[PDB]
Design a protein around this ligand. Sequence first.
Ligand SMILES: [Mg+2]
Ligand SMILES: [Mg+2]
Lengths: 247, 247
Amino acid sequence: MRILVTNDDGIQSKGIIVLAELLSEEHEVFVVAPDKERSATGHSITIHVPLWMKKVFISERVVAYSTTGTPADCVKLAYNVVMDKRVDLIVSGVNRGPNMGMDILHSGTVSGAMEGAMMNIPSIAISSANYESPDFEGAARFLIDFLKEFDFSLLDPFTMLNINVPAGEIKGWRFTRQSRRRWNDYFEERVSPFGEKYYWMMGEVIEDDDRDDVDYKAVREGYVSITPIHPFLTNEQCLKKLREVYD
Amino acid sequence: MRILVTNDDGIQSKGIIVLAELLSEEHEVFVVAPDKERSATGHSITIHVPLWMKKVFISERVVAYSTTGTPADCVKLAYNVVMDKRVDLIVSGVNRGPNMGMDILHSGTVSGAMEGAMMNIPSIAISSANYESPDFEGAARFLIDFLKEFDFSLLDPFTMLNINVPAGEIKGWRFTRQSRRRWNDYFEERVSPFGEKYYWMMGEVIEDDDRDDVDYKAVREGYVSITPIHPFLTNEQCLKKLREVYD
Ligand SMILES: [Mg+2]
Ligand SMILES: [Mg+2]
């Protein structure tokens, strides 16, 4: 099948290269990713200025291009300009560091796969859960095995899979729900050479979920976390309550 | 609701047209059916040669395509290329004639709905239990009412419903088990103009099930037969015996 690979750490990232190589063993792989590493860009897209692409190679069996856009921009370009609107699977990763809880909202890795989900194409976001010491190969190999055991018809429309792989040894895998893991921000103030102060964003993690089947608890125990997510943010319970009171 | 409608009698059958027109009154209907008779094709699929489709609108609220494939091919084509993997319900019928007992093994109607079950999509096979004098409208009317009261969450994975509606009065509905109804086969021999003999398959029905809750008994009493079936044929009882003996 025709597979599209992208990421948010840049086309030269080892995380995207190993992933492309392994997948190219049995499928037609196309790589379209940012020319340079992106930060917490969330689901940003480029509409106010033009986008540019550059054909670069990584090896045979794989056609690759780097772009001046975001991960979502990359998926839009690959689908319309490079793959003739014929894409069977989209994989965004392997990211350096975890993408769990509310942090998924500002994740470029997740954004790439979510763009695929909005187009109704089977998509997967995969991250190695250790920023300091990532294991790109381990995450990529897990993915190859998982694909042979997963029934994609079970993935509902506009739905993608957010996967986080433990950096150490993998005990197994679990289907999880997104946690409420978030951060308690704060800033450190400093002064520039001009006497003007600037601020550095900092923070401490908050893990207070009471449910046992959330993403970070699985990873903490050495299990791969697999969460099905979609682009629908309506709080149904709240909506029902509002309608009952204001009927 | 996005409903996929197919059949095994052919895209121009009165049974599929009646069903499609009535469902389109409240739902978004997509019809993908064979371009010819395929009643006794069973669960055959096309993998050695290409498949083709032809748009053949039937109305405004309904999009229709005929195909050179089998009923099962129709469902695969509908889900993957016509409906963009967005299917809420699959209905195969209304077939002209009954589909009960062992006859479901060679039924194109049941095969199409089974393709749905294999993808864990709510699916229904519906037939008007009288080949010579069917009541397509009646069967359709019944389904429409059934869809408004049945709770599909009750269906187990890989499970579909095989429904047979009496052609006369419908006294009500009953959840049944598949019967062992089959036929006493035999061939009539004839000779061609060139001296070569050919054979015509013929038969007489065998109704010898001693259980009272089987499909054909319900239909004979004037009640709709609703049987939950799945793609598993292992004879558990026999398997346990063979092991307890050998091993
Ligand atoms: Mg990154
Ligand atoms: Mg038929």
